[PDB]
């Protein structure tokens, strides 16, 4: 039973920086959360596919946080260190999620983006990428220059093409930017492909895993299954 001490699954797997630490390894029956409400998703946004994600992270053999592409060098052409925010701060300084990189413009103009992970070893590779929706076209051009801009995640077993919806949502942690969160899965066959002219929060860390099926005991609101027998009913 994996049990989080500092936050709900939103921020833990994204790396909100009250989350960080966690526990010792992974093979876990099901998750337990210390539930933040106002505090869960840091920079305000909707987590797409969040409840399906709730149960794929349930019965799991292992896990790996690995450097999908490293923040540093993966992006020759996009300014890789500038996005961090007060919404997701730390030490009073303005931080950002650990497992993704907010990619703002390098020297005003944003070319097509090519990046891809091609898998090899079979384990389920969980890749995550946020999508950012500027408050205004001010918020917009000063980050990703192309005011007409998109995001397309290629798969095989997945495809989606996003697009920012720019408008001023009410303030959440002083932020009228809103972001969106999406998680694909690339199995031993597939070769993932990203690309965009903007509004993409690209993965840094991502996970190799293996599941089975399971769980079932949880909180109302918020192998070892049937075995052979136990030492009573059959042999003695």
């Amino acid at each position, epitope marked *: 039973p994996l049990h989080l001490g500092k936050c709900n699954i939103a921020g833990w797997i994204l790396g909100n920086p009250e989350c960080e630490s*966690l526990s010792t390894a992974s093979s876990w029956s099901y998750i337990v959360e210390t539930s933040s409400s106002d505090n869960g998703t840091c920079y305000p946004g909707d987590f797409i596919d969040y409840e399906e994600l709730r149960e794929q992270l349930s019965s799991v053999s292992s896990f790996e946080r690995f450097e999908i592409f490293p923040k540093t060098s993966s992006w020759p052409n996009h300014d890789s260190n500038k996005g961090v925010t007060a919404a997701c701060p730390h030490a009073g300084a303005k931080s950002f999620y650990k497992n993704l990189i907010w990619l703002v413009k390098k020297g005003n103009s944003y070319p097509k983006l090519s990046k891809s992970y091609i898998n090899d070893k079979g384990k389920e590779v969980l890749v995550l990428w946020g999508i950012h929706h500027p408050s205004t076209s001010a918020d917009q051009q000063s980050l990703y220059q192309n005011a007409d801009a998109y995001v397309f995640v290629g798969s095989s077993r997945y495809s989606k093409k996003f697009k920012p919806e720019i408008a001023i949502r009410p303030k959440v942690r002083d932020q009228e930017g809103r972001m969106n969160y999406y998680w694909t899965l690339v199995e031993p066959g597939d070769k993932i492909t990203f690309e965009a002219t903007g509004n993409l929060v690209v993965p840094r860390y991502a996970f*190799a895993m293996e599941r089975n099926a399971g769980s079932g005991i949880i909180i109302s609101d918020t192998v070892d299954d049937g075995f052979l027998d136990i030492w009573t009913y059959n042999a003695e």
Partner: antibody, heavy 120, light 111 residues
């Protein structure tokens, strides 16, 4: 399981290219890399290049000037070393990456060395 | 920069165990994971993998060598200190992030 590099001396600002050689097979897949050892102490890793979807990883004290490539048939990797400062004289250990299993932990082994030297 | 740093340079008879140790800025552990991979260099020729991921002893390496630590700090330990060890040991590359070499320790053997 083998490793073979080379290069000697440069009058700073010149460009050099360190070769490396592999035998111990399956080179088509593996990640490979270099770590120069500074004199007087020694420091750190100068590039990390992948097997497929060719991607290149560097040090931010390096990033601009270095090009790391590989060939998969003649089965070599190289370091093209450009715009050279007295600061970077070291020896260059060519080294691979034992991944398999999930993570990509580290490098099992590294060629003898080649002392790249930067002077007039 | 993501940097580690050792318990300097101290020295022992060839009697028995010393501990080189690492202190990583962030946490390089997630878990069932860790990161730090020990390397030894013979003072005057090329690098050697000993311990990787703090725990697992590289097949081909001596037994005496041991290591453990949780995630923030690590320790190398070579118990029956041998005349053969004595070489400038590093601490390594941490996670996958910018990859950074701790910088080393001498290990002098007292005869």
């Amino acid at each position: 399981k083998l490793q073979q590099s080379g290069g000697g001396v440069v009058q700073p600002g010149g460009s050099l290219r360190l070769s490396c050689a592999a035998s111990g097979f399956t080179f088509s897949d593996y990640d490979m890399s270099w770590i120069r050892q500074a004199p007087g102490k020694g420091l750190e890793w100068v590039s990390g290049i992948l097997g497929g979807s060719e991607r290149s990883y560097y040090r931010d004290s390096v990033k601009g000037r270095f090009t790391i490539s590989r060939d998969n048939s003649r089965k070599t990797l190289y370091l093209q070393m450009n715009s050279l400062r007295a600061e970077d004289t070291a020896v260059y250990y060519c080294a691979r990456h034992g991944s398999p299993g999930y993570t990509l932990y580290a490098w099992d082994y590294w060629g003898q060395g080649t002392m790249v030297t930067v002077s007039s | 920069i993501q940097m580690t740093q050792s318990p300097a340079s101290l020295a022992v008879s060839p009697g028995q165990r010393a501990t080189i140790t690492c202190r990583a800025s962030e946490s390089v552990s997630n878990y069932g994971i860790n990161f730090i991979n020990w390397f030894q260099q013979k003072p005057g020729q090329p690098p050697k993998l000993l311990i990787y991921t703090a725990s697992n002893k590289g097949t081909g390496v001596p037994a005496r060598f041991s290591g453990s630590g949780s995630g923030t700090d690590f320790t190398l330990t070579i118990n029956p200190v041998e005349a053969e060890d004595t070489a400038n040991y590093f601490c390594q590359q941490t996670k996958e992030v910018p990859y950074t070499f701790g910088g080393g320790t001498k290990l002098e053997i007292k005869r």
